Amino acid sequence: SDKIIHLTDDSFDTDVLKADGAILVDFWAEWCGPCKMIAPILDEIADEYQGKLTVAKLNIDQNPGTAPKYGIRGIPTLLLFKNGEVAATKVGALSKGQLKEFLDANLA
Numbered sequence: 237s238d239k240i241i242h243l244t245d246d247s248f249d250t251d252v253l254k255a256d257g258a259i260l261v262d263f264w265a266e267w268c269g270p271c272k273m274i275a276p277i278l279d280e281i282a283d284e285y286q287g288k289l290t291v292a293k294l295n296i297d298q299n300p301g302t303a304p305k306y307g308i309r310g311i312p313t314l315l316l317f318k319n320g321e322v323a324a325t326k327v328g329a330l331s332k333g334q335l336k337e338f339l340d341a342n343l344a
Contacts, residue, residue, distance in 0.1 A: 239282040241292040245301035251292060253320040258289035258343060263306075263313045265297050270329035271312040277332050281339070288343060289316075316342050 241251050243261070252259050262278055264271035282291040296303045296311065306315060306322070316324040316339070324342035326335075 237279070237282075239286070239291065240278065241290055243292045243294040243299065243302075245299045248294070248299075248302050252317055255290065255317070256319060258319075258323075259317040260289055260291050260339065261315045261317060262291070262293045263296050263303055263308050263315070264293060264311055265295060268311050273329050274312055274335075277335065280332055281335060284336075285339065289339070314338075 241259075243251055252261060260278075260281070262271075262274070264275070266272075278291050278293070285291070294302055296308070306313075310327045312327075312329065314326045314335075315322050324338065326338055330338070
């Protein structure tokens with residue numbers, strides 16, 4: 237993309253778990269309706285939140301390893317990482333407005 241980290245099983249530790257800041261990970265798949273529905277929305281958020289957090293996308297079919305370690309079932313699942321630790325969790329789609337509220341409240 238441009239600002240979105242395109243994650244893999246092998247880059248997860250470095251990209252997410254080792255990052256000095258907040259990472260908003262999207263677990264998601266090509267066939268998933270709601271994932272695709274929010275994909276443009278993650279684009280918007282990556283812009284508005286520059287220097288506050290980085291957005292990262294793990295497609296859980298091309299990267300099957302990492303999902304089971306966070307007990308993911310329902311997709312999309314958005315996970316806020318704070319310096320490699322999960323602060324917050326949202327399952328399913330939500331609008332841009334609903335995601336602002338989530339981040340703003342959990343980034344504090």
